[PDB]
Design a protein around this ligand. Structure first.
Ligand code: MG
Length: 535
């Protein structure tokens, strides 16, 4: 049903689709190839539905955060722009479109929250959150407010909360580590505590939401609000004389708003991928293409350096790009769904006083990471937690020999499935510090173990530990702030002393697993199906 020899494009109705149509027109003129631009309602749920059947548009436009999901589900083609082309766009925008080290879409535009202020009430807006309480005091005396913005959505409260070391999921080269969330830290505790205080001191109301803050600002009741470029046109109407600027710092740290990147993906089912590439690279992403779209409906800041340079002559667009640069690319993976919820709850519970800052944050810090995985992730999670509660840290710390062993860690477990699918091998990295105190060392080494499915007498079928031993090359010693003497020794002592105090624990942990996880794993090993991801 996808036609070869033309291009169908889907983009949201609040974007500049007519302008984009004009781009398609120039394209047809040069190449003769026809371009159709549609804006179906709920295109973001429609694309995965139709694309999964091998139908849909050749190119889908949408915020980059969905694209991760689409990639996992095989819906998106890898895009192949040359480095010369890549130089044309800001690097961080290319990071918004990475999935597993690959480019999955073309960045188009960028948006982030900014501080929006009323120039008649507040000609010189504050550079720090801390000076807001004092400013609210003055203004109430003049019968007005310092600051009003939506506290109902964690999107709006996140810039403050995450200002010091906060993050959603840790980014590593196109990959997010879904087990590593940054919601809870001193930064987050301070930021959220500050917000809650502003509510206790009546500088804000806990029940303030988008509509209330928008009205209050657009009616000139409050001096400041926090919002994005989509809000601008309503203020243009309001006649309020406004400016848009960098978000205030908290404890000298920049605010850390989430960054959305409007992006263009190519349908993995499209017969037109090369034409799509040609259209996107040579037609749409140019001063001219972007101009067409922007004049139809404004893009805000854009990913194309040349055109962004023009737009940023507009100080609000410039401010938007500045807040983006200081901000956090929204993770492009579906687990964000748990994150939002975890965080939403926490904030609402904190501002209502239903929970303390620390408890809301601690719950959230746990729940954001709690999305269930398939067998491989479940197994490695289960094994790690098992070893930890089985007291493996103690076993390391209390390893015998002047010396003090410290900082025992379980590292990230590895997993390998036999090519035939019938066999399974676990790598358990372990670490400790040695104090020769003076002369501190970091030791790391692996224990590898086989996991086996075994029927015994007869229909009884179980999951048992194969050979549990040190990994031969694995031992690595590292100076911290003699050897090869020490290491020379540790090579012939350590691996055996570790593996002997451990393999038994590994053996108990295997048995302590959820019984259905065990049955499903066994069931797949028997029939030799691969649930394990090549790394
Ligand atoms: Mg950059």
């Amino acid at each position: 049903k996808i036609e070869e020899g033309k291009l169908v494009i889907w983009i949201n109705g609040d974007k500049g689709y007519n302008g984009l149509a004009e781009v398609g027109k120039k394209f047809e003129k040069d190449t003769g190839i026809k371009v159709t631009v549609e804006h179906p309602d709920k295109l973001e749920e429609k694309f995965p539905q139709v694309a999964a059947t091998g139908d849909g548009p050749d190119i889908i436009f949408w915020a980059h955060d969905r694209f991760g999901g689409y990639a996992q589900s095989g819906l998106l083609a890898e895009i192949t722009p040359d480095k010369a082309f890549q130089d044309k766009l800001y690097p961080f925008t290319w990071d918004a479109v990475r999935y597993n080290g690959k480019l999955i879409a073309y960045p188009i535009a960028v948006e982030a929250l900014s501080l929006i202020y009323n120039k008649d009430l507040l000609p010189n807006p504050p550079k720090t959150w801390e000076e807001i309480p004092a400013l609210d005091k003055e203004l109430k005396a003049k019968g007005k407010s310092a600051l009003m913005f939506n506290l109902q959505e964690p999107y709006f409260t996140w810039p403050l909360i995450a200002a010091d070391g906060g993050y959603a999921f840790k980014y590593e080269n196109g990959k997010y580590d879904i087990k590593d969330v940054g919601v809870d830290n001193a930064g987050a505790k301070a930021g959220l505590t500050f917000l809650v205080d502003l509510i206790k001191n009546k500088h804000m109301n806990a029940d303030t939401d988008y509509s209330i803050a928008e009205a209050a600002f657009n009616k000139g009741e409050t001096a400041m609000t926090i919002n994005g470029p989509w809000a601008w046109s309503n203020i243009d109407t309001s006649k309020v004389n406004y400016g848009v600027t960098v978000l205030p710092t908290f404890k000298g740290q920049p605010s850390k708003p989430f960054v959305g990147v409007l992006s263009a993906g190519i349908n993995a089912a499209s017969p037109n991928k090369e034409l799509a590439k040609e259209f996107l690279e040579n037609y749409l992403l140019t001063d001219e293409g972007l101009e067409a779209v922007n004049k139809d409906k404004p893009l805000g800041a854009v990913a194309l350096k040349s055109y962004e340079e023009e737009l940023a002559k507009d100080p609000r667009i410039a401010a938007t790009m500045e807040n983006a640069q200081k901000g956090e690319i929204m993770p492009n993976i579906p687990q964000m769904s748990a994150f939002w919820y975890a965080v939403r709850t926490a904030v609402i519970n904190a501002a209502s006083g239903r929970q303390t800052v620390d408890e809301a944050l601690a719950a959230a810090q746990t729940n954001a990471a709690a999305s269930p995985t398939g067998l491989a992730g479940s197994l490695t999670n289960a094994l790690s937690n098992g070893l930890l509660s089985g007291g493996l840290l103690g076993i390391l710390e209390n390893l015998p020999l002047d010396i003090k062993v410290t900082d025992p860690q379980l590292l990230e477990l590895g997993l390998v499935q036999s090519p035939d699918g019938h066999r399974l091998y676990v790598t358990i990295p372990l670490g400790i510090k040695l104090q020769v105190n003076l002369l501190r060392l970091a030791v790391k080494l692996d224990i590898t173990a086989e996991i086996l499915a075994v029927r015994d007498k007869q229909e009884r079928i179980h999951l048992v530990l194969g050979d549990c031993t040190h990994s031969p090359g694995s031992l690595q010693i590292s100076l911290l702030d003699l050897l090869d003497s020490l290491t020379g020794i540790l090579n012939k002592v350590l691996p055996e002393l570790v593996q002997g105090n451990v393999c038994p624990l590994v053996n108990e942990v295997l048995r302590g697993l959820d019984i259905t996880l065990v049955h499903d794993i066994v069931n797949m090993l028997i029939h030799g199906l691969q649930f394990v991801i090549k790394v």
